[PDB]
Amino acid sequence: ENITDMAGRSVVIPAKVERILLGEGRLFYAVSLLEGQKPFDRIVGWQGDFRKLDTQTYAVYKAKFPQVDNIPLIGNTTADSISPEKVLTLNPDIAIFGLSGHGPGKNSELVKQLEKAGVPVVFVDFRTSPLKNTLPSMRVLGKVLHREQQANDYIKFYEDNVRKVTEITSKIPADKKPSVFIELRAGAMEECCGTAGKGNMGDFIDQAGGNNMAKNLLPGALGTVNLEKVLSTNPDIYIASGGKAPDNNAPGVSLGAQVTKEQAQSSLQTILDRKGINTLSAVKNGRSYGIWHNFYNSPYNVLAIQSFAKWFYPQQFADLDPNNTMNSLYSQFLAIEPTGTYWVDST
Amino acid sequence: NITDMAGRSVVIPAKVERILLGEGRLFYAVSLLEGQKPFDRIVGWQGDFRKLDTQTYAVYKAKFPQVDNIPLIGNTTADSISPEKVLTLNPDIAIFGLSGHGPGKNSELVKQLEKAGVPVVFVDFRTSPLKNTLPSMRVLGKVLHREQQANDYIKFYEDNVRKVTEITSKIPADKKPSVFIELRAGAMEECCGTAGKGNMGDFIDQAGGNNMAKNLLPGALGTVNLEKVLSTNPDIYIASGGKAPDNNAPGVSLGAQVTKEQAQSSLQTILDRKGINTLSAVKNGRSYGIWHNFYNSPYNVLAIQSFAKWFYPQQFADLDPNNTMNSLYSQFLAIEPTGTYWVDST
Numbered sequence: 001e002n003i004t005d006m007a008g009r010s011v012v013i014p015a016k017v018e019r020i021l022l023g024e025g026r027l028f029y030a031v032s033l034l035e036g037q038k039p040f041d042r043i044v045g046w047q048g049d050f051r052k053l054d055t056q057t058y059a060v061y062k063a064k065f066p067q068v069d070n071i072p073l074i075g076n077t078t079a080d081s082i083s084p085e086k087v088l089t090l091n092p093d094i095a096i097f098g099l100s101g102h103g104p105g106k107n108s109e110l111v112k113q114l115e116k117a118g119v120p121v122v123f124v125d126f127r128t129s130p131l132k133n134t135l136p137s138m139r140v141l142g143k144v145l146h147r148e149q150q151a152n153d154y155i156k157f158y159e160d161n162v163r164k165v166t167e168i169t170s171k172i173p174a175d176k177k178p179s180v181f182i183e184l185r186a187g188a189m190e191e192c193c194g195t196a197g198k199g200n201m202g203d204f205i206d207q208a209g210g211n212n213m214a215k216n217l218l219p220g221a222l223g224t225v226n227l228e229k230v231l232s233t234n235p236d237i238y239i240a241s242g243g244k245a246p247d248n249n250a251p252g253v254s255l256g257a258q259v260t261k262e263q264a265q266s267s268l269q270t271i272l273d274r275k276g277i278n279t280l281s282a283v284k285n286g287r288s289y290g291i292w293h294n295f296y297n298s299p300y301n302v303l304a305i306q307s308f309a310k311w312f313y314p315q316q317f318a319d320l321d322p323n324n325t326m327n328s329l330y331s332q333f334l335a336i337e338p339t340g341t342y343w344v345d346s347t
Numbered sequence: 348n349i350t351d352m353a354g355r356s357v358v359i360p361a362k363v364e365r366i367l368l369g370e371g372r373l374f375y376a377v378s379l380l381e382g383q384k385p386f387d388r389i390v391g392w393q394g395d396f397r398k399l400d401t402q403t404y405a406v407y408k409a410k411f412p413q414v415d416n417i418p419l420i421g422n423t424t425a426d427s428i429s430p431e432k433v434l435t436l437n438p439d440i441a442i443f444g445l446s447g448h449g450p451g452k453n454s455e456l457v458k459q460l461e462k463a464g465v466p467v468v469f470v471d472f473r474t475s476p477l478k479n480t481l482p483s484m485r486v487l488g489k490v491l492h493r494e495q496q497a498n499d500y501i502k503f504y505e506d507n508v509r510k511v512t513e514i515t516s517k518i519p520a521d522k523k524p525s526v527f528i529e530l531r532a533g534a535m536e537e538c539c540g541t542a543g544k545g546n547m548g549d550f551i552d553q554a555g556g557n558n559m560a561k562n563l564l565p566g567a568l569g570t571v572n573l574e575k576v577l578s579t580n581p582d583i584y585i586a587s588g589g590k591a592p593d594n595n596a597p598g599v600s601l602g603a604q605v606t607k608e609q610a611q612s613s614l615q616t617i618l619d620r621k622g623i624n625t626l627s628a629v630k631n632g633r634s635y636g637i638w639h640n641f642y643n644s645p646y647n648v649l650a651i652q653s654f655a656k657w658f659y660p661q662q663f664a665d666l667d668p669n670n671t672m673n674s675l676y677s678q679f680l681a682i683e684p685t686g687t688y689w690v691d692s693t
């Protein structure tokens with residue numbers, strides 16, 4: 001029994017899996033949809049990005065599962081910090097990697113080492129090409145992790161909840177669509193402004209019937225557009241992504257499992273009060289929003305596609321509630337209770 | 348015909364030569380129109396300019412001794428104006444303020460003058476400076492036949508204010524400093540006089556400040572208690588005064604005959620008062636003095652600039668209100684600028 005991963009490579013499905021290696025820690029999100037009430041039972045080790053770049057969601061899982069602290073960290077937050085030696089001594093029976101991100105890619109040496117060691121490697125993608133790859137990735141993870149039921153259940157849930165948006169936005173003509181700029185990790189990078197091109201959160205803008213102003217400024221899924229180019233284009237809608245912890249007075253939007261609506265809106269406002277940004281038509285008109293950054297690499301990204309549609313056409317999606325979708329998602333699939341703020345509107 | 352600041356229609360006289368000033372310090376608006384002949388057309392005025400602006404008065408007297416012979420229609424209050432002395436001056440126009448030390452739109456004297464066939468014009472630099480200062484000058488221009496001087500002054504004013512507002516109009520509320528202005532600080536019976544939504548409050552608004560008394564008061568002027576100031580503990584403290592140097596009464600010395608030393612020394616007395624002296628703004632040195640009469644004068648662009656430099660020192664490093672003042676005097680007035688109209692604490 002073989003399968004085609006997101007890198008086009010054929011992978012032989014292991015008879016039994018009990019030692020999953022996560023190339024990128026936040027790939028846990030895809031795994032969590034399959035493992036039910038035993039989320040960490042089969043994880044031998046992971047990249048440190050989930051523990052260090054998702055401190056809020058981490059803490060919530062730790063309070064219910066303290067054994068999460070004992071899962072080995074194969075590195076910090078970059079592919080280059082992964083020791084291939086520590087990886088191999090964990091004797092994984094499968095390794096899950098992302099086409100892009102803070103972990104090894106299809107051409108890394110570690111991938112070749114693992115192939116020499118007889119360890120199946122699966123490439124998924126929620127980051128470069130979410131629209132093409134999210135559902136195929138879950139289908140594949142289902143097959144190789146022996147959780148076809150959970151995967152098929154989640155695909156049905158996802159397709160249905162996305163179809164609620166696309167049934168409407170797929171028929172909207174281009175000239176009625178709002179222009180949109182998404183500023184990733186707004187306020188929190190050295191150089192403004194990170195954003196998404198034809199890929200990443202750009203796919204969400206496309207699906208939600210928006211017009212991404214960076215679509216044709218950038219060759220890749222991620223890139224950089226200068227502040228003045230944003231000011232010049234003066235888009236209808238401004239969106240900032242962040243995942244900053246509540247009690248961090250550094251610049252950035254606070255969003256995540258431990259963030260209250262008050263902190264999300266107070267910190268979004270700081271972001272919108274920055275020189276230049278604050279003269280945007282979208283900011284002055286109040287079409288300014290915050291979205292949780294890690295949706296940029298998670299099959300929970302249907303929550304962001306829905307939040308986008310409701311910001312792009314408020315009345316046409318008055319009846320749609322992403323909080324109900326998150327709650328249906330958590331209750332049906334996860335082992336923790338939903339808390340915090342994953343998106344916010346300016347007041 | 349023109350519409351004054353009270354919404355009333357006034358038939359502009361064909362020729363004006365006998366101007367009555369309901370409030371003496373309305374002279375300031377007139378001075379911008381009369382060039383080198385400032386007092387030529389004034390038949391009489393309220394005594395507030397002569398008695399509450401002794402410094403600016405003395406400077407004009409030294410160059411124009413005939414100013415002493417302009418009749419005083421009263422002292423410093425509307426109720427002290429003899430309507431009889433007013434009418435025997437046979438004015439051909441009367442200029443009054445919506446508020447202040449002179450008659451308002453509903454006074455008996457205004458009705459008497461209407462019965463006597465005398466045009467009355469209401470201006471305002473005091474209640475709503477932001478709304479009213481420029482419209483007031485436009486109107487005075489038309490009724491006094493000095494449209495050129497008025498239009499020249501409006502252009503000067505707008506340009507010098509726009510230097511501030513083009514910056515501060517884009518600043519968000521959460522980056523603005525909190526400000527308290529204490530009018531005639533030290534000099535009132537009960538502390539502390541200040542401005543609400545109006546008067547010098549308009550200047551704080553324009554200069555991108557946050558007036559702590561904006562929502563404490565219903566009117567343009569009022570009073571807030573010392574303890575309320577201490578409790579709000581604002582970023583920036585400003586005291587207004589116009590006291591003459593050789594006046595042993597309490598208050599801040601500012602005006603045409605005041606040196607920076609006298610201004611600095613007398614501001615310090617004001618800042619050394621119990622309670623005031625523990626303010627964060629005073630301890631941090633964000634404490635300032637502004638000349639009181641800017642509370643009712645179209646020269647108020649000088650204060651708006653002084654506030655802006657105090658509210659954002661670097662963003663207005665290059666802006667100099669002394670140069671604005673010098674340009675104003677040379678272009679419009681008949682005397683030489685002297686003295687200290689603003690001061691920073693040592």
Ligand SMILES: N=C(N)NCCC[C@H](NC(=O)c1cccc(O)c1O)C(=O)N[C@@H](CO)C(=O)O
Pocket residue numbers: 077078079099100101102105184185194195222296
């Ligand atoms: N801390 C580092 N020096 N690198 C992190 C590695 C991944 C890098 N990340 C981004 O470009 C990025 C942009 C916006 C928001 C984010 O959260 C990001 O992580 C990256 O993506 N590299 C690309 C190309 O280098 C890749 O691996 O495909």
Ligand SMILES: N=C(N)NCCC[C@H](NC(=O)c1cccc(O)c1O)C(=O)N[C@@H](CO)C(=O)O
Pocket residue numbers: 053185188189190191243293
């Ligand atoms: N590829 C790069 N060189 N920079 C882009 C990303 C690297 C780094 N990312 C994060 O810190 C991060 C945090 C939370 C979630 C994520 O997905 C992240 O990538 C980053 O942004 N560094 C800043 C330095 O402050 C920068 O590049 O300006």
Ligand SMILES: N=C(N)NCCC[C@H](NC(=O)c1cccc(O)c1O)C(=O)N[C@@H](CO)C(=O)O
Pocket residue numbers: 423424425445446447448530531540541568642
């Ligand atoms: N000497 C008096 N009794 N009254 C003065 C007349 C005007 C009175 N003035 C003030 O309240 C005032 C406050 C702070 C600083 C100043 O320079 C002031 O003149 C006043 O404003 N009256 C109001 C209410 O009647 C008005 O004229 O509408």
Ligand SMILES: N=C(N)NCCC[C@H](NC(=O)c1cccc(O)c1O)C(=O)N[C@@H](CO)C(=O)O
Pocket residue numbers: 399531534535536537589639
């Ligand atoms: N409304 C009042 N009763 N008093 C406040 C204003 C009256 C008087 N004003 C002045 O002395 C004055 C001086 C220079 C410039 C001005 O505009 C002035 O108004 C005043 O302040 N009286 C004090 C006691 O002296 C007071 O009434 O608190």
Ligand SMILES: [Fe+3]
Pocket residue numbers: 102
């Ligand atoms: Fe990242």
Ligand SMILES: [Fe+3]
Pocket residue numbers: 448
């Ligand atoms: Fe007064």
